[PDB]
Amino acid sequence: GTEHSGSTVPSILNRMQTNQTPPTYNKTNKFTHGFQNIVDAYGIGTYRE
Amino acid sequence: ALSDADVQKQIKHMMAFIEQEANEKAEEIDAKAEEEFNIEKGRLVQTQRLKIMEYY
Amino acid sequence: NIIAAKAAEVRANKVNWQSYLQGQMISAEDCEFIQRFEMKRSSEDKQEMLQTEGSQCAKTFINLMTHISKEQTVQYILTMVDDMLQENHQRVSIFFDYAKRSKSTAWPYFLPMLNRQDPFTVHMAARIIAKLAAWGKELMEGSDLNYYFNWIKTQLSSQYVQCVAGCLQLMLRVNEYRFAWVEADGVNCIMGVLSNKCGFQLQYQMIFSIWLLAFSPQMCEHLRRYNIIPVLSDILQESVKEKVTRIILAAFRNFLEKSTERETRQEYALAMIQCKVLKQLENLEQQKYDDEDISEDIKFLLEKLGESVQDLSSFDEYSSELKSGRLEWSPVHKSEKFWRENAVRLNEKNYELLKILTKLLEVSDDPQVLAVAAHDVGEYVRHYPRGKRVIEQLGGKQLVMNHMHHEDQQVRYNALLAVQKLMVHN
Amino acid sequence: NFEKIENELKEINTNQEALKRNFLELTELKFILRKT
Secondary structure (H helix, E strand, C coil), X not given: XXXXXXXXXXXXXXXXXXXXCCCCCCCCCCCCHHHHHHHHCCCCCCCCC | CHHHHHHHHHHHHHHHHHHHHHHHHHXXXXXXXXXXXXXXXXXXXXXXXXXXHHHC | CHHHHXXXXXXXXXXXXXXXXXXXXXXXXXXXXXXXXXXXXCHHHHHHHHHCCCCCCCCCCCCHHHHCCCHHHHHHHHHHHHHHHHHCCCCCCCCCCCCCCCXXXXXXXXXXXXXXXXXXXXXXXXXXXXXXXXXXXXXXXXHHHHCCCCCCHHHCCCHHHXXXXXXXHHHCCCHHHHHHHHHCXXXXXXXXXXXXXXXXXXXXXXXXXXXXXXXXXXXXXXXXXXXXXXHHXXXXXXXXXXXXXXXXXXXXXXXXXXXXXXXXXXXXXXXXXXXXXXXXXXXHHHCCCCCHHHHHHHHHHHHHHHHHHHHHCCCHHHHHHHHCCCCCCCHHHCCHHHHHCCXXXXXXXXXXXXXXXXXXXXXXXXXXXXXXXXXXXXXXXXXXXXXXXXXXXXXXXXXXXXXXXXXXXHHHHHHHHHHHHHCCCC | CHHHHHHHHHHHHHHHHHHHXXXXXXXXXXXXXXXX
16 A cells, blocks of 8 residues: 555554454355355354354 | 554654644745735835825 | 754764863864853853854854864764754844854855765755845845755755755745846746656645745746646646645635736636636535635635636637637637527627638638537527528538538537537427 | 536437437328328
C-alpha cells in the first residue's frame, strides 16, 4: 500500500488484548469444507474449543 | 524494542505534521495581516492626499 | 530533514570557547558576549544586548565567521551564534543589531559566502539573505542576489531546496522588490521549477509564492501573458494534498479579487474554458470542512465563476463568432437559457443567421463547425415547427442528409441527430 | 461519460419508438393511397 502511493506512512499496528471475545476460524480445504459445513449447521463453539 | 521505536515513530509523525500545519496557518494569517496593513495605508494615503492638494 | 540532522549534530556540541575566553584566535572580546547572554531565555540578557549599543551584535560576530577558517569547527562556531540569529523570538526582532558604523557589518558582507555549496555554506547564507520582512532593515542591492547562483544551483538535485524556497517565499512579501523581481526573470525560474515535476510540497511552495505575488495587481497584469491559471487548475485536478488545493483556491480568489481592468481579464472565461473548475468545486462543496477559509474561497469561486458563465450568455458575441467562419465552442451552444429565452434571436432578418450557417455548412466541412451549426440548428428547430418548414424550404435538410456521408462518423452522427430533430411530425 | 453513453442509448430508444410510430402512420397513408 505504501508502494502504491509513496508517502512513507508507517501504518503502525500495535497489539493488545482485553475482555474482547475474538472471532473463531479453523482452516478448511476442498476435501474437508463440506464436513465443516455440516458441523457449522448447528452453530459454532467457543473460542479455542 | 520495536514497539517503543514505533511509538516514537508515531510521535515524530504526529508532532511534526501538526507543527507544519500550525506554521502554515500562521504564515497565511500573517500574509493576510500584511495585506491588511497595505489596504490601510492606501486608505489613509487617499485621506491625506486630498487635503494635500487642497492646501497647496 | 537533512538540515534537521545537521542541526541535531551541531546542537549536541557545547563549544569549548571558554578556553578561548580571551584568546585572540577565537573571540577575545566576543566570549564575554557569550558568557553573558548565555541565557537567551532571559529578558535581562536581551536588554543588556541592547545596552551594548550593537557594539558586537551583527558587528563582530560578523567577521567572527572570518576569524574561523577550519571547516570541522566552522560549522559548530557558526551554529553557536546562528541559533541566536535564527531562533530569534524577540532577541533581534526589528534589526536591534544595527551596527551603524560599518556597512561591512550591515549587509553587503554576504559576497564571500555562496561558495562551495555543501557544508551548510550557501544554507546559512540563504538564512542571512532572509533578513528583510520581519526585521528593521531593507535590501540595499536587489541585483546582488537576484541572478546569483544561490537560487540557480538548487534547480535540480534536497531538503536544502526546500530551505532555499522557504527563504525565498519569506523574502517575497514586500512588493517593492517583488515588482523588480517579476520584471526580472524570477517568473522564468518559477516556471522552470513548475515544469520540473517534483514533490507535492515543493509545488505547494511555488503556488504559495505565486499567490503572495498575486497580492500585487501590477504583477498579475504582467503575469497574465502566462498560462499560470490553467496549470494551477490542472495541478488541482491531478494532485489532491489538502493544503495544495487550499493555496490553489487562494490563488484563484486573488486573481478574481483584484480585476483591475475587466477587458484584459479574458481569464474570467479562460479559467473555466481551459478547465471547468465548477464540477470539482461542487464535489468540494459536497464535502464539509471545519476551515471556514476553504469553504469561503469555494463559495466565492462558485459565485464569481457563475457570474462569468452568465457573461458568456449573449447573442451578439455569439453571432459574431458564427460570422467569423471559425466556430469556437463558446459554451452558449448548449445553454438551456440560450434555447428558451433567446431562441427567436437566431431568426434574424428572413432567418439571416440560419442562412449564414447554412452557407458555412455547404462551404466548410470541418467536423467541429459542422457539429456546432447542426446542433444549434437542432436546438432552435426543436421549438419552432414553422422554423422546421423554413429550414426544409432552404434545402439545407438535404445538405445535412448529404453530410450524413462525411468521412468522419461523428459528423454523420450529428447529421443523424439533426434529422431526428426534424423527424417530428414528418 | 459512461452514463452519458447510456443517455445516448435512452435517446436512441425513444427516437426509434417514435420512428416506428411514424412508420406505421405513414404506411397507413400509403394504404389509403392505393385506390383510384
